[model samples]
Target: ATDIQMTQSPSSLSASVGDRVTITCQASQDINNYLIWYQQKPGQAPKLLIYDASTLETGVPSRFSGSGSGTEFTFTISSLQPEDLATYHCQQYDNLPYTFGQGTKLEIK
Candidate 1:
């Protein structure tokens, strides 16, 4: 395989608190559930949110969840919060030279 390209939907989104938001990620091939999601807030380091498709990282809120497998995956925020504003990324670790999506910017609307 050449490389797995992750296609992210929409480039940005604007939503207010209490709204349910979702970010989609698609891979070029069947990579199983070897994907990880992360969040990067302005002026802050990126934090891990989900891994193995649906596993939430420690300390992460239950309102945040992930689903799908293989080529199709998604990240969702049950109820948008003020601190949830950030750029989200999806990376595939199934193969060597792991790569990440371009990222989706979520702003307060």
Candidate 2:
């Protein structure tokens, strides 16, 4: 079995509505952008944020995005939405045994 760990940090001290946040993914091997990023509201199921590294899912806001090559990957939310303040997750759909990052929570504080 293999594992992938993702660490998310805001580019700034604070992030507000419509702001951008970047999430970095570190894989144990060559992942090749076969990852999927998701957005989760307070009590709702997580929404598909980005897939295939840079491909945005349908119906997702234009602000959300992902970009990376090879082992290093990045997930970004441009112009974050008020409702977007919640938990974000990264998943690798490349393999059968799907794996997801621990998760990054966003707050209004």
Candidate 3:
């Protein structure tokens, strides 16, 4: 079974503490609304940042946002935080076999 292609832009990014940082993703096919976004730290399990491409997960701050549809998607930080230094990843469940994006590294500017 072939996995769907999930492409993330910038692969790496740096933003100010309170800057509005944004990341984009494009899928090989129309994934509809079945995308998930995650935040991963050095020594911790990844936290679900956004579900269904635009729904914020419980306990996650409203500053984080997910958007777009069909083959394109986006994730944004309204105001970057010190703890935001980590890798951001996107996953898709629309396909028979799930697929994940090549993690994006976020750093302080």
Candidate 4:
């Protein structure tokens, strides 16, 4: 068996409001639609932003989104917020032993 690896640049980075930040995920195999993306605030629980590729979870803000197919996926936050400054992660819930990306932290630029 093989393990999947996910990565992001400038692990802790800064961006201005309305600026687009791109996060890329590479999987060991074809992950299909079993993936989910989440955003976490400094001291609060994480918010599910997108799941199964383009499907947004209920009650999520309009600014959070994700798009891509197969083993490659991207998550974008339309507009940055001070409250949105935290960590983001990609997870695969399609199969047992669910896995998640290491996580990326964000801050105000």
Query: Candidate 4: where are CA atoms >4 Å away?
Result: none
Model 1 C-alpha lDDT per residue in residues 1-109, reported as the tens digit of each score: 6889988886699999999999999999887999999998878878989999999999999999999998999999999989898899999999877988999999886
What does the lDDT come to for candidate 4? 0.77
For model 2, residues 32-69, the per-residue Cα lDDT tens digits are 76988887776888888788889888887787778886
lDDT of 4 by residue, 23-57 (tens): 76666667887788887776778787898988999
Q: Report lDDT (CA) for all predictions.
A: 0.91, 0.72, 0.91, 0.77
Cα deviation in Å at residue 59, candidate 1? 0.6
Candidate 3 per-residue lDDT, tens place, 23-107, comes to 9888999999999999888899999999899999999999999998899999999988898998999999988788999988999
| 2 against 3, candidate with superior lDDT | 3
3 or 4, greater by lDDT? 3
Off by over 4 Å in 2: 4-14
List the pairs of residues colliding in candidate 3.
Answer: none
Cα deviation of 29 in candidate 4 (Å)?
Answer: 1.4
Q: Assess candidate 3 and give its lDDT.
A: 0.91
Q: Give the candidate order by descending TM-score.
A: 1, 3, 4, 2
| Weakest ten-residue segment in model 4 by summed lDDT | 1-10
lDDT of 4 at 86: 74
Give TM-scores for every candidate, taking all chains together and pairing residue i with residue i.
0.95, 0.81, 0.95, 0.85
Candidate 2: residue 45 Cα off by (Å): 1.3
